[PDB]
Amino acid sequence: HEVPSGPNPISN
Amino acid sequence: NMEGDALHSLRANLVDPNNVLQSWDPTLVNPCTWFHVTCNNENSVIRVDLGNADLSGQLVPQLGQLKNLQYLELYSNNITGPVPSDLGNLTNLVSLDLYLNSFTGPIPDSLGKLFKLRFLRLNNNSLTGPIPMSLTNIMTLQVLDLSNNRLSGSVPDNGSFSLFTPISFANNLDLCGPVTSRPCP
Amino acid sequence: FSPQLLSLLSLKTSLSGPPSAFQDWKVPDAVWCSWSGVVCDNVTAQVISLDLSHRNLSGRIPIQIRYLSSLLYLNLSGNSLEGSFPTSIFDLTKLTTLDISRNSFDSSFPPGISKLKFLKVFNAFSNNFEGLLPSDVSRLRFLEELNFGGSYFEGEIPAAYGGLQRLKFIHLAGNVLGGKLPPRLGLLTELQHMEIGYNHFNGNIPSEFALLSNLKYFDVSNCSLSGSLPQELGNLSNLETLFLFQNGFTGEIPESYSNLKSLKLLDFSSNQLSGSIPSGFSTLKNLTWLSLISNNLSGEVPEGIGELPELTTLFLWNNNFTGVLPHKLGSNGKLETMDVSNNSFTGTIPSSLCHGNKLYKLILFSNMFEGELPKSLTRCESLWRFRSQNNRLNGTIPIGFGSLRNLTFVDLSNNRFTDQIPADFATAPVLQYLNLSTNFFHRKLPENIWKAPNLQIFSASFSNLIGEIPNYVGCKSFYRIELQGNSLNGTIPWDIGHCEKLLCLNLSQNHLNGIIPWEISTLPSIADVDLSHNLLTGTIPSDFGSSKTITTFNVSYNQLIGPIPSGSFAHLNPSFFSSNEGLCGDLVGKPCN
Ligand SMILES: *[C@@H]1O[C@H](CO)[C@@H](O)[C@H](O)[C@H]1NC(C)=O
Ligand SMILES: *[C@@H]1O[C@H](CO)[C@@H](O)[C@H](O)[C@H]1NC(C)=O
Ligand SMILES: *[C@@H]1O[C@H](CO)[C@@H](O)[C@H](O)[C@H]1NC(C)=O
Ligand SMILES: *[C@@H]1O[C@H](CO)[C@@H](O)[C@H](O)[C@H]1NC(C)=O
Incomplete structure (x- = not known):
């Protein structure tokens, strides 16, 4: 199990 | 962008020596700004056109999750592997063109589940097994080309298959029927 | 030989791995201390350090x-x-140090862990653990760093944990953990880094959390936490990172936050936060990333954001915001990426956005923006993705776009842009998408247009176009062309068979005439063709029915005459050819011969 880290990426 | 993740699954399992998929960016709000993907005004994917992309490798069953997918064009590529029964999970699919590839395995009976389907071309592939009868329940079917394969079986003449000349089923392994040359048991 | 040696040897053999891993460990006096991964205490020969990792080594631990x-x-x-x-x-x-991370260990976590006690660092991150967080670990007073994340840990966060006085760093992130976040947590005074996200929690952020002074990194993201953002948080003066994104937070953003002067990255995205932005936000001069994406946020954007010497990533998209963008924006010269789309933003685009030429992704779309398009924007080297669709931007379009070696995506569709389309547009080397559609142009396409080195999609549809359609000279990369809905006259070029990759071509609602070139019968992948509502007259090409790829031909409302092809055309829809009074065949109903 690896987990996301950081600011939220989603983009346009 | 669920279907984005799906299209990206396909991408990841895929060999793309020329980087056409290179525009396919999982962190995008949806894949409607992707190349080779075409969405509607509701921003769901209705089209994927990868024909002639020199793609190798295979497909993932995740392709089922595109609920509004209409035209899926994968033809003329090095894509091998099997054909996912989860393609039956695509209802609004009007056209499925997988032709000119290395695909192996059966033609999924789940394909008999696409009732908006008009064009079906698996021709010039490596496919084996019989021709699923449920296919005959698609009365929207216009063009069926199963020709040039390993297909074993007997060819249906009922339902939509009423309209099909032999040029559709030509050049296979043992195939038997009145739609063809040589009858059977 | 020594128990150290029996130990290392037994460890060697009990762990199944590629022989490359243990290659140096064979025994002929204090020998084992040489070995790779082993470090011994130079007086005592005893093995004080054992590092073996990324050894592709699996098995049971002796x-x-x-x-x-x-x-x-x-x-x-x-x-x-x-x-x-x-x-x-x-x-x-x-x-003092134990890293078991990135491995497969599972089931529960055995109780005896407090026995270590002088333990500083524990890293269990990325394993298959299930079960409640061991309460037991709460008893090592000297524990500094604890990473339990990357597993699936059931149950709540033991409040007991708030009692590790010396704990600097805590990672529980990406587990199944749940419920209310225990207030007792504000009692780790020495605590610097806290990452607990990607589990499922509810309730508020405990006000008591304002008690961690030395706190820097705080990420609670992708949880169910809700309610108001606590004012008190404005007091962590050391805080360089705050990620609250994807939760249920509500009410206005407290003005007090104007007080983290050390704040660098702030991400509030996908929440319910309402009301304007703090006027005081203009004051964080250490701020790099600011992301408010997808909230209920309102009011103007503080003019003061114009210069934050360090501002880099600005995401305001998907709110209802009003007023001008801060006008000196981008002048800090470090600006990289901005997306303000889906708002009520009005006024003029800042001239200085690229003042430093570090900016690549610019999304201005679906706004109330008026006025001309910054000339300075053609001076931005780094420009790669630009989408301005659905705005009031006016006047002629700026002329310098073809310079940029990095620019691959452009949408100007639905604006008030008038006059000429820039000529250098098809000279620009990388540009893969161009949408100029639905504008006021009242001019014509460049000769350059079809020469675009790698350009896939092009849409000028419904902008007031006029004139002949420039001959396609070495049509290269184009798969989709929408020229429809215009005043274009003249004829469909002789050479159109130059676009091999062409798929959907919509040419309809125009002033076109002459014939329909046979060359299209030879486009190898061609799918959709919409030619309707023109003065086109001639015949429908012989060999077209021989194409396995056309599913669409709409020639309706034209002057066409002659027979329709028996071919793929058999499977076609009659109403495609209607209002062509001169066609004969089956699908028009009137026979030839
Ligand atoms: C299809 O199959 C046959 C037999 O393998 C092959 O010789 C023929 O050239 C193929 N057609 C195409 C489109 O290349
Ligand atoms: C005949 O065709 C129908 C579809 O109309 C199919 O359901 C049925 O299984 C086929 N079999 C026979 C022998 O009738
Ligand atoms: C343990 O080892 C890995 C690789 O050797 C390293 O990247 C990691 O930082 C180490 N952990 C600690 C905290 O000592
Ligand atoms: C801002 O950041 C720099 C670099 O980390 C640092 O020297 C300075 O202490 C910080 N200033 C503030 C306002 O904390």
Whole structure:
């Protein structure tokens, strides 16, 4: 199990 | 962008020596700004056109999750592997063109589940097994080309298959029927 | 020989791995201390450090450990090995450091962990653990760093944990953990880094959390936490990172936050936050990333954001915001990426956005923006993705776009842009998408247009176009062309068979005439063709029915005459050819011969 880290990426 | 993740699954399992998929960016709000993907005004994917992309490798069953997918064009590529029964999970699919590839395995009976389907071309592939009868329940079917394969079986003449000349089923392994040359048991 | 040696040897053989891993460990006096991964205490020969990781090594972890008693360091990482965690390791006890991370260990976490006690660093990150967080670990007073994340840990966060006075760093992130976040947590005074996200929590952020002074990194993201954002948080003066994104937070953003002067990255995205932005936000001069994406946020954007010397990533998209963008925006010269789309933003685009030429992704779309398009924007080298669709931008379009070696995506569709389309547009080397559609142009396409080196999609549809359609000269990369809805006259070029990759071509609602070139019968992948509502007259090409790829031909409302092809055309829809009074065949109903 690896987990996301950081600011939220989603983009346009 | 669920279907984005799906299209990206396909991408990841895929060999793309020329980087056409290179525009396919999982962190995008949806894949409607992707190349080779075409969405509607509701921003769901209705089209994927990868024909002639020199793609190798295979497909993932995740392709089922595109609920509004209409035209899926994968033809003329090095894509091998099997054909996912989860393609039956695509209802609004009007056209499925997988032709000119290395695909192996059966033609999924789940394909008999696409009732908006008009064009079906698996021709010039490596496919084996019989021709699923449920296919005959698609009365929207216009063009069926199963020709040039390993297909074993007997060819249906009922339902939509009423309209099909032999040029559709030509050049296979043992195939038997009145739609063809040589009858059977 | 020495128990150290029996131990290391037994460890060697009990771990199945590629022989490359243990290559140097064979025995002929204090020999084992040479070995790779082993470090011994130079007086005592005892093995005080054992690092073996990314060794592609799987297996069971020997019970002949604890035979090396004075051992202060144990690192096993990335090696895929599963089990219930060994309780044997707890009996090592001089350990100050233990990394079991990125492995497969599962089931529960064995209770005996407090036996270590002098333990500083524990990293269990990325394993298959299930079960409640061991409460037991709460009793090592000297524990500094604890990473339990990357597993699936059921149950709540033991409040007991708030009692590790010396704890600097805490990672529980990416587990199944749940419920209310225990207030007792504000009692780790020494605490710097806290990452607990990606689990499922509810309730508020405990006000008591304002008690961690030394706190820097705080990420609670992707949880269910809700309610108001606590004012009190404005008091962590050391805080360089705050990620609250994807939760249920509500009400206005407290003005107090204007007080983290050390704040660098702030991400509030996908929440319910309402009301304007703090006027005081203009004051964080250490701020790099600012992301408010997808909230209920309102009011103008503080003019003061114009210069934050360090501002880099600005995401305001998907709110209802009003007023001008801060006008000196981008002048800090470090600006990289901005997306303000889906708002009520009005006024003029800042001239200085690229003042430093570090800017690549610019999304201005679906706004109330008026006025001309910044000329300075053609001076931005880094420009790669630009989408301005659905705005009031006016006047002629700026002329310098073809310079940029990096620019691959452009949407100007639905604006008030008038006059000429820039000529250099098809000279620009990388540009893969161009949408100029639905504008006021009242001019014509460039000769350059079809020469675009890599350009896939092009849409000028419904902008007031006029004139002949420039001959396609070495049509290269184009798969989709929408020229429809205009005043274009003249004829469909002789050479159109130059676009091999062409798929959908919509040419309809125009002033076109002459014939329909046979060359299209030879476009190899061609799918959709919409030619309707023109003065086109001539015949429908002989060999077209021989194409396995056309599913669409709409020639309706034209002057066409002659027979329709028997071919793929048999499977076509009659109403395609209607209002062509001169066609004969089956699908028009009137026979030839
Ligand atoms: C299809 O199959 C046959 C037999 O393998 C092959 O010789 C023929 O050239 C193929 N057609 C195409 C489109 O290349
Ligand atoms: C005949 O065709 C129908 C579809 O109309 C199919 O359901 C049925 O299984 C086929 N079999 C026979 C022998 O009738
Ligand atoms: C353990 O080892 C891995 C690789 O050797 C390293 O990247 C990691 O930082 C180490 N952990 C600690 C905290 O000692
Ligand atoms: C801002 O950041 C720099 C670099 O980390 C640092 O020197 C300075 O202490 C910070 N200033 C503030 C306002 O904390």
